[PDB]
Coordinates of C-alpha atoms and ligand atoms in Angstrom, one line a residue:
Chain A
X1 CA 35.9 -18.8 32.2
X2 CA 32.6 -19.8 33.9
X3 CA 30.9 -22.8 32.4
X4 CA 27.9 -22.6 30.1
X5 CA 25.6 -25.6 29.6
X6 CA 22.6 -25.4 27.2
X7 CA 19.9 -27.9 27.5
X8 CA 18.6 -28.5 24.0
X9 CA 16.5 -30.6 21.6
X10 CA 17.1 -30.8 17.8
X11 CA 13.5 -29.9 16.9
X12 CA 13.4 -26.8 19.0
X13 CA 13.7 -23.4 17.2
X14 CA 13.9 -21.7 20.6
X15 CA 17.0 -23.8 21.6
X16 CA 18.3 -23.2 18.0
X17 CA 18.4 -19.5 18.6
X18 CA 20.8 -19.9 21.5
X19 CA 23.1 -22.4 19.8
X20 CA 23.5 -19.9 16.9
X21 CA 24.4 -17.1 19.3
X22 CA 26.9 -19.2 21.2
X23 CA 28.6 -20.2 17.9
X24 CA 28.7 -16.5 16.9
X25 CA 30.3 -15.7 20.2
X26 CA 33.0 -18.2 20.0
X27 CA 32.0 -19.5 23.4
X28 CA 33.1 -22.7 25.0
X29 CA 29.9 -24.4 26.0
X30 CA 28.2 -27.8 26.5
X31 CA 24.9 -28.9 25.0
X32 CA 22.8 -31.6 26.5
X33 CA 19.8 -33.1 24.7
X34 CA 16.6 -33.4 26.8
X35 CA 13.6 -35.5 25.7
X36 CA 11.3 -32.7 27.0
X37 CA 8.2 -33.7 25.1
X38 CA 8.0 -37.5 25.9
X39 CA 10.3 -38.2 28.8
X40 CA 11.4 -35.3 31.0
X41 CA 14.1 -36.2 33.5
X42 CA 13.2 -35.8 37.2
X43 CA 16.1 -33.4 37.6
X44 CA 15.2 -31.1 34.8
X45 CA 13.1 -28.7 36.9
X46 CA 16.2 -28.0 38.9
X47 CA 17.6 -26.2 35.8
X48 CA 14.3 -24.8 34.6
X49 CA 11.3 -24.8 36.9
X50 CA 9.2 -23.9 33.9
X51 CA 10.0 -27.3 32.4
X52 CA 10.9 -25.9 29.0
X53 CA 13.7 -26.1 26.5
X54 CA 16.1 -24.3 26.2
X55 CA 17.5 -24.1 29.7
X56 CA 20.9 -22.7 30.6
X57 CA 23.2 -23.1 33.5
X58 CA 26.1 -20.7 34.1
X59 CA 29.0 -21.1 36.4
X60 CA 29.1 -23.2 39.5
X61 CA 31.4 -26.3 39.7
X62 CA 31.9 -28.3 36.6
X63 CA 29.4 -31.2 36.8
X64 CA 27.7 -33.6 34.4
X65 CA 24.6 -31.8 32.9
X66 CA 22.3 -34.5 34.4
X67 CA 23.7 -33.7 37.9
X68 CA 23.2 -29.9 37.9
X69 CA 24.6 -28.0 40.7
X70 CA 22.5 -25.7 42.9
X71 CA 25.4 -23.2 42.6
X72 CA 25.0 -22.4 38.9
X73 CA 22.9 -19.5 37.7
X74 CA 19.7 -20.9 36.1
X75 CA 18.8 -18.7 33.1
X76 CA 15.4 -19.1 31.4
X77 CA 13.9 -17.7 28.2
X78 CA 15.7 -17.8 24.9
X79 CA 15.7 -14.1 24.2
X80 CA 17.1 -13.5 27.7
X81 CA 19.8 -15.9 26.9
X82 CA 20.6 -14.1 23.6
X83 CA 21.1 -10.8 25.4
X84 CA 23.1 -12.6 28.1
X85 CA 25.5 -14.1 25.5
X86 CA 26.0 -10.6 24.0
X87 CA 26.7 -9.3 27.5
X88 CA 29.2 -12.0 28.3
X89 CA 31.2 -11.7 25.0
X90 CA 31.3 -8.0 24.1
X91 CA 34.3 -8.5 21.8
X92 CA 32.2 -10.7 19.6
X93 CA 30.0 -7.7 18.7
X94 CA 26.8 -9.7 18.9
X95 CA 25.0 -6.4 19.0
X96 CA 25.9 -3.1 17.3
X97 CA 27.4 -0.4 19.5
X98 CA 25.3 2.4 18.0
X99 CA 22.1 2.9 20.0
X100 CA 19.8 3.4 17.1
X101 CA 21.2 0.3 15.3
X102 CA 20.9 -1.7 18.6
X103 CA 17.2 -0.5 18.7
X104 CA 16.7 -1.9 15.1
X105 CA 17.9 -5.3 16.4
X106 CA 15.6 -5.1 19.4
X107 CA 12.6 -3.9 17.3
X108 CA 13.1 -6.7 14.9
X109 CA 13.1 -9.3 17.6
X110 CA 9.9 -7.7 19.1
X111 CA 8.2 -7.5 15.7
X112 CA 8.9 -11.3 15.3
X113 CA 7.7 -12.1 18.7
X114 CA 4.6 -10.0 18.8
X115 CA 3.3 -10.4 15.2
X116 CA 4.9 -13.5 13.5
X117 CA 5.8 -16.1 16.1
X118 CA 2.1 -16.5 17.2
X119 CA 1.0 -16.9 13.6
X120 CA 3.6 -19.6 12.9
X121 CA 2.3 -21.4 16.0
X122 CA -1.4 -21.0 15.2
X123 CA -1.0 -22.0 11.5
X124 CA 1.2 -25.0 12.2
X125 CA -0.3 -26.3 15.4
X126 CA -4.0 -25.2 15.1
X127 CA -4.3 -24.9 11.3
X128 CA -5.5 -21.4 11.4
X129 CA -5.6 -19.4 8.2
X130 CA -2.3 -18.7 6.5
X131 CA -3.1 -15.2 5.1
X132 CA -2.4 -13.4 8.5
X133 CA 0.9 -15.3 8.8
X134 CA 1.9 -14.2 5.3
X135 CA 0.9 -10.6 6.1
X136 CA 3.0 -10.7 9.3
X137 CA 6.0 -12.1 7.3
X138 CA 5.6 -9.3 4.7
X139 CA 5.7 -6.8 7.5
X140 CA 8.8 -8.4 9.0
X141 CA 10.5 -8.5 5.6
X142 CA 9.8 -4.8 5.3
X143 CA 11.9 -4.1 8.4
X144 CA 15.0 -5.6 6.8
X145 CA 17.5 -3.2 5.1
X146 CA 16.4 -3.2 1.5
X147 CA 19.7 -3.7 -0.2
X148 CA 20.8 -6.8 1.7
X149 CA 22.4 -7.4 5.1
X150 CA 20.9 -8.5 8.4
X151 CA 18.2 -7.0 10.6
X152 CA 20.5 -4.3 12.1
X153 CA 23.0 -4.2 9.2
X154 CA 25.8 -6.3 10.6
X155 CA 24.7 -9.7 11.9
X156 CA 23.3 -9.6 15.5
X157 CA 21.4 -11.6 17.9
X158 CA 18.2 -10.4 16.2
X159 CA 19.1 -12.8 13.3
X160 CA 19.7 -15.6 15.8
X161 CA 16.3 -15.0 17.2
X162 CA 14.5 -15.2 13.8
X163 CA 16.3 -17.6 11.5
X164 CA 15.4 -20.8 13.4
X165 CA 11.7 -20.2 12.6
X166 CA 12.1 -19.0 9.0
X167 CA 14.6 -21.7 8.1
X168 CA 12.2 -24.4 9.3
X169 CA 9.3 -22.9 7.3
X170 CA 10.6 -23.9 3.9
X171 CA 11.4 -27.6 4.5
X172 CA 8.4 -28.1 6.8
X173 CA 6.1 -26.8 4.0
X174 CA 7.8 -29.0 1.4
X175 CA 7.3 -32.1 3.7
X176 CA 3.6 -31.2 4.4
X177 CA 4.3 -30.8 8.2
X178 CA 1.6 -28.9 10.1
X179 CA -2.1 -29.0 10.7
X180 CA -3.0 -26.4 8.0
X181 CA -5.1 -27.4 5.0
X182 CA -3.7 -28.5 1.7
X183 CA -5.1 -25.3 0.1
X184 CA -3.1 -23.2 2.6
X185 CA 0.0 -25.4 2.1
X186 CA -0.1 -24.6 -1.6
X187 CA -0.8 -20.9 -0.9
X188 CA 2.1 -20.6 1.4
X189 CA 4.5 -22.5 -0.8
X190 CA 3.6 -20.3 -3.8
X191 CA 3.8 -17.1 -1.7
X192 CA 7.2 -17.9 -0.3
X193 CA 8.5 -18.7 -3.8
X194 CA 6.9 -15.5 -5.3
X195 CA 8.6 -12.2 -6.0
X196 CA 6.7 -10.7 -3.0
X197 CA 9.1 -12.6 -0.7
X198 CA 12.4 -12.3 -2.6
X199 CA 13.9 -10.2 0.2
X200 CA 13.2 -12.7 3.0
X201 CA 14.5 -15.6 0.9
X202 CA 17.8 -13.7 0.5
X203 CA 17.8 -13.1 4.3
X204 CA 17.3 -16.8 4.9
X205 CA 20.0 -17.8 2.5
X206 CA 22.4 -15.2 4.1
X207 CA 21.7 -16.4 7.6
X208 CA 22.0 -20.1 6.6
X209 CA 25.3 -19.5 4.9
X210 CA 27.0 -18.6 8.1
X211 CA 28.9 -21.3 10.0
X212 CA 26.7 -20.6 13.1
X213 CA 23.8 -22.1 11.1
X214 CA 25.5 -24.9 9.4
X215 CA 27.1 -26.0 12.7
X216 CA 23.7 -26.0 14.6
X217 CA 21.4 -27.5 11.8
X218 CA 21.0 -31.2 11.5
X219 CA 20.2 -30.8 7.8
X220 CA 16.8 -30.2 6.2
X221 CA 15.6 -33.8 6.1
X222 CA 16.9 -34.6 9.6
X223 CA 15.2 -31.5 11.1
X224 CA 12.0 -32.6 9.4
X225 CA 12.3 -36.0 11.0
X226 CA 12.9 -34.4 14.4
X227 CA 9.8 -32.3 14.0
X228 CA 7.7 -35.3 13.2
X229 CA 8.3 -36.5 16.8
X230 CA 6.6 -33.4 18.2
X231 CA 3.2 -34.5 19.5
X232 CA 1.4 -31.2 18.5
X233 CA 2.4 -32.1 14.9
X234 CA 0.0 -35.1 14.9
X235 CA 0.4 -36.8 11.5
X236 CA -2.8 -37.0 9.5
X237 CA -4.8 -34.2 11.1
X238 CA -5.8 -31.0 9.3
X239 CA -8.0 -28.0 10.1
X240 CA -10.1 -26.3 7.4
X241 CA -11.8 -22.9 7.1
Chain B
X1 CA 21.3 16.4 22.4
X2 CA 19.1 14.5 20.0
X3 CA 15.4 15.0 20.6
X4 CA 13.0 12.3 21.8
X5 CA 9.3 12.4 21.2
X6 CA 7.0 9.7 22.6
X7 CA 3.5 9.4 21.1
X8 CA 1.3 8.3 23.9
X9 CA -2.2 7.8 25.3
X10 CA -3.2 7.8 29.0
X11 CA -5.0 4.4 28.9
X12 CA -2.0 2.6 27.3
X13 CA 0.1 0.3 29.6
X14 CA 2.6 -0.1 26.7
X15 CA 3.1 3.6 26.5
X16 CA 3.3 3.9 30.2
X17 CA 6.3 1.5 30.2
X18 CA 8.3 4.0 28.1
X19 CA 7.3 7.1 30.1
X20 CA 8.5 5.4 33.3
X21 CA 11.8 4.6 31.8
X22 CA 12.3 8.1 30.3
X23 CA 11.6 9.5 33.8
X24 CA 14.1 7.1 35.4
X25 CA 16.7 8.1 32.8
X26 CA 16.4 11.8 33.5
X27 CA 15.8 12.3 29.8
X28 CA 14.6 15.4 28.1
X29 CA 11.6 14.4 26.0
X30 CA 8.3 15.4 24.6
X31 CA 5.0 13.5 24.9
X32 CA 2.2 13.9 22.4
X33 CA -1.2 12.3 22.9
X34 CA -2.7 10.5 19.9
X35 CA -6.4 9.4 19.8
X36 CA -5.3 6.1 18.4
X37 CA -8.6 4.3 19.4
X38 CA -11.0 6.5 17.4
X39 CA -9.3 9.3 15.5
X40 CA -5.9 8.4 14.3
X41 CA -4.2 11.4 12.5
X42 CA -3.4 10.9 8.9
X43 CA 0.3 11.5 9.6
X44 CA 0.6 8.9 12.3
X45 CA 1.7 6.0 10.0
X46 CA 4.8 8.2 9.2
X47 CA 6.0 7.7 12.8
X48 CA 4.6 4.1 13.2
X49 CA 3.3 2.2 10.1
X50 CA 1.9 -0.4 12.5
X51 CA -0.6 2.2 13.7
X52 CA 0.0 1.5 17.4
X53 CA 1.0 3.5 20.5
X54 CA 3.6 4.0 21.7
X55 CA 5.6 5.5 18.8
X56 CA 8.9 7.2 19.2
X57 CA 11.0 9.5 17.1
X58 CA 14.6 10.2 17.8
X59 CA 16.9 12.9 16.5
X60 CA 16.2 14.9 13.4
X61 CA 15.3 18.6 13.3
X62 CA 13.1 19.8 16.1
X63 CA 9.6 19.9 14.7
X64 CA 6.0 19.9 16.1
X65 CA 5.1 16.3 16.9
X66 CA 2.2 16.4 14.4
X67 CA 4.7 17.4 11.7
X68 CA 7.2 14.5 12.1
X69 CA 10.4 14.8 10.1
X70 CA 11.5 12.1 7.7
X71 CA 15.0 12.6 9.2
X72 CA 14.2 11.3 12.6
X73 CA 14.7 7.6 13.5
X74 CA 11.3 5.9 14.0
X75 CA 11.5 3.4 16.8
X76 CA 8.7 0.9 17.3
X77 CA 7.8 -1.6 20.1
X78 CA 7.8 -0.6 23.8
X79 CA 10.4 -3.2 25.0
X80 CA 12.8 -2.1 22.2
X81 CA 12.3 1.5 23.4
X82 CA 13.1 0.4 27.0
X83 CA 16.4 -1.2 25.9
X84 CA 17.1 1.9 23.8
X85 CA 16.6 4.3 26.7
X86 CA 19.0 2.1 28.8
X87 CA 21.6 2.3 25.9
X88 CA 21.2 6.1 25.6
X89 CA 21.6 6.9 29.3
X90 CA 24.2 4.5 30.7
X91 CA 24.9 6.7 33.7
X92 CA 21.3 6.2 34.8
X93 CA 22.0 2.5 35.3
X94 CA 18.6 1.4 34.0
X95 CA 20.1 -2.1 33.7
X96 CA 22.6 -3.7 36.1
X97 CA 26.1 -4.0 34.9
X98 CA 26.6 -7.6 36.0
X99 CA 25.6 -10.0 33.1
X100 CA 23.8 -12.5 35.4
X101 CA 21.7 -9.7 37.0
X102 CA 21.0 -8.2 33.6
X103 CA 19.8 -11.6 32.6
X104 CA 17.4 -11.7 35.6
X105 CA 15.9 -8.4 34.2
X106 CA 15.6 -9.8 30.7
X107 CA 14.1 -13.1 31.9
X108 CA 11.5 -11.3 34.0
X109 CA 10.5 -9.1 31.1
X110 CA 10.2 -12.4 28.9
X111 CA 8.2 -14.2 31.7
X112 CA 5.8 -11.4 31.7
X113 CA 5.5 -11.2 27.9
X114 CA 5.3 -15.0 27.3
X115 CA 3.2 -16.2 30.2
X116 CA 1.3 -13.3 31.9
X117 CA 0.4 -10.7 29.4
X118 CA -1.6 -13.1 27.3
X119 CA -3.5 -14.2 30.4
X120 CA -4.4 -10.6 31.3
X121 CA -5.6 -10.2 27.7
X122 CA -7.8 -13.4 27.8
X123 CA -9.4 -12.5 31.1
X124 CA -9.9 -8.8 30.4
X125 CA -10.9 -9.0 26.8
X126 CA -12.6 -12.4 26.6
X127 CA -13.6 -13.2 30.2
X128 CA -11.9 -16.5 30.1
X129 CA -11.4 -18.1 33.6
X130 CA -9.2 -16.3 36.0
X131 CA -7.3 -19.3 37.4
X132 CA -4.7 -19.5 34.6
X133 CA -4.0 -15.8 35.1
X134 CA -3.6 -16.2 38.9
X135 CA -1.3 -19.1 38.2
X136 CA 0.8 -17.1 35.8
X137 CA 1.0 -14.2 38.3
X138 CA 2.1 -16.6 41.1
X139 CA 4.9 -17.8 38.7
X140 CA 6.0 -14.2 38.0
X141 CA 5.8 -13.4 41.7
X142 CA 8.1 -16.3 42.3
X143 CA 10.7 -14.8 40.1
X144 CA 11.0 -11.8 42.3
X145 CA 13.6 -11.8 45.1
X146 CA 11.5 -13.2 48.0
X147 CA 13.0 -11.0 50.7
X148 CA 12.5 -7.7 48.9
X149 CA 13.7 -5.6 45.9
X150 CA 12.9 -5.2 42.3
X151 CA 13.1 -7.9 39.6
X152 CA 16.9 -7.7 39.2
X153 CA 17.5 -6.4 42.7
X154 CA 18.0 -2.7 41.9
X155 CA 15.4 -1.0 39.9
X156 CA 15.6 -1.7 36.2
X157 CA 13.7 -1.5 32.9
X158 CA 12.2 -4.9 33.8
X159 CA 10.1 -3.1 36.4
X160 CA 9.1 -0.4 33.9
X161 CA 7.9 -3.2 31.6
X162 CA 5.7 -4.9 34.2
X163 CA 4.3 -2.3 36.6
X164 CA 1.9 -0.7 34.1
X165 CA -0.1 -3.9 33.9
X166 CA 0.1 -4.9 37.5
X167 CA -0.8 -1.4 38.6
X168 CA -3.9 -1.3 36.4
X169 CA -5.1 -4.6 37.7
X170 CA -6.3 -3.5 41.1
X171 CA -8.4 -0.4 40.2
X172 CA -9.7 -2.0 37.0
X173 CA -10.9 -4.9 39.2
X174 CA -12.5 -2.6 41.7
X175 CA -14.3 -0.8 38.9
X176 CA -15.5 -4.1 37.4
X177 CA -13.9 -3.1 34.1
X178 CA -13.2 -6.1 31.8
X179 CA -15.2 -8.9 30.3
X180 CA -14.8 -11.3 33.3
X181 CA -17.9 -12.0 35.5
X182 CA -18.5 -10.5 38.9
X183 CA -17.8 -13.9 40.3
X184 CA -14.3 -14.0 38.7
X185 CA -13.8 -10.4 39.7
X186 CA -14.5 -11.2 43.4
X187 CA -12.2 -14.2 43.1
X188 CA -9.4 -12.2 41.6
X189 CA -9.8 -9.4 44.2
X190 CA -9.8 -11.8 47.1
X191 CA -6.8 -13.7 45.6
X192 CA -4.7 -10.5 45.1
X193 CA -5.5 -9.4 48.7
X194 CA -4.6 -12.8 50.2
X195 CA -1.3 -13.9 51.7
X196 CA -0.6 -15.9 48.5
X197 CA 0.0 -12.6 46.7
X198 CA 1.6 -10.6 49.5
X199 CA 5.0 -10.4 47.6
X200 CA 3.5 -9.0 44.4
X201 CA 1.5 -6.5 46.4
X202 CA 4.8 -5.3 48.0
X203 CA 6.3 -5.1 44.5
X204 CA 3.4 -3.0 43.2
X205 CA 3.7 -0.7 46.2
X206 CA 7.5 -0.4 45.7
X207 CA 7.2 0.5 42.1
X208 CA 4.3 2.9 42.6
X209 CA 6.2 4.8 45.3
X210 CA 8.9 5.9 42.8
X211 CA 8.5 9.3 41.2
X212 CA 8.7 7.7 37.8
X213 CA 5.3 6.2 38.6
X214 CA 3.7 9.2 40.3
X215 CA 4.8 11.5 37.4
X216 CA 3.3 9.2 34.7
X217 CA 0.1 8.1 36.4
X218 CA -3.1 10.1 36.2
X219 CA -4.5 8.6 39.4
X220 CA -6.5 5.5 39.8
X221 CA -9.9 7.0 39.1
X222 CA -8.6 9.0 36.1
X223 CA -6.9 5.9 34.7
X224 CA -10.1 3.9 35.1
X225 CA -12.0 6.6 33.2
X226 CA -9.5 6.5 30.4
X227 CA -9.7 2.7 30.3
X228 CA -13.5 2.9 30.0
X229 CA -13.0 4.6 26.6
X230 CA -11.1 1.5 25.2
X231 CA -13.4 -0.4 22.8
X232 CA -11.9 -3.8 23.6
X233 CA -12.7 -3.4 27.3
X234 CA -16.4 -3.1 26.4
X235 CA -17.5 -1.0 29.4
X236 CA -20.7 -2.4 30.7
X237 CA -20.2 -5.9 29.2
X238 CA -19.4 -9.2 30.9
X239 CA -19.2 -12.8 29.7
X240 CA -20.4 -15.5 32.1
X241 CA -19.2 -19.1 32.2
Ligands
CA1 CA1 11.2 -0.9 5.0

């Protein structure tokens, strides 16, 4: 019964994770867009002292999101929010019940975090070499069940953690968004279209097919336009090695 | 009834995390040291194809750890192992039951992963300036309950995740181990002894006083000697300005 408010921005893959999980939970919740990169509201540190999106408030009196209550719980960090939503809505089965399968989900989220996420960030924002990213993606692909299905078999929060980033990759590459070189843009587009990456393309289609994705995605072109407003994606700059 | 084997190494704070949680769970488990730095056994990629410590096997037939069975579950990534141990031993209450308190635990583990660990890595491996690390530690300190307790109040896996790194900081600094300069080492030692960091000192004391730490720690001098064998810590080497 207690209220959930998610502070969000369309470009943000980290906020996207949490919208997906809230959709999969069937939760009642409010979203509130925050111009975190160009015009942070003076009240925003009251909901997240770290000054990042996403931010979540939970409980307290029902108030407008730009008048946050000191009485709500302030929850930070998108992966903490995913686990919290699974904890709040156990009947939605956002994690498996089997401990080994639950560990597959947690392992997949840690493999993404520790090997892949930083490569996406370095390739896109610093234009570092794309090969290490493709290697990390091949490793992540190898953790998926071979025959189809999601990270832990049934859909879980592990798939909410990863799909925002993989789903952005394809249309960002098609639009030439990111500070990597033309040569590495071609390399990545060819790789991600190659038989080497058939399994992760099926994973992306399977995640995107779910209502939780359709209902939290502005569309490929609209997401590209949102991403173009991110300052660290300077138009017209590329790094070469 | 299903067996647990943890592949470990004394120097490793990531492996230490999991040993602490296994102690707190009251689990029956085997540990097996692997010279992952210098002499990785040919069979080790069968338990962890990422070729890192820690590695875990679960279930399957009881076999010598250097003859791993294809029938055991192979679990990778220390934080996934922590959540797995919590799932396997619910009567041990390694997480709170309340969703908001559980979220404090998950948020603290993500704050450490996303803000603090990388700063420890930069300072210790590259000798980058200490100030950003001290800043990140003050942030993490701020997430603790100011008047006392562990990250989520009661002890949880969040404290298993973080104490290996905080507990190494003090004796590594007093040994001058790491690529930072003597000037930054003095600065860090003074900062961590000052009233600014009194709360995090209390936290380190409180975690170290638990049997789970005593039983998984070789002693400060012994741990320093094991750390001197780590190639990335470059014993005898320091970068300046
Ligand atoms: Ca595989």
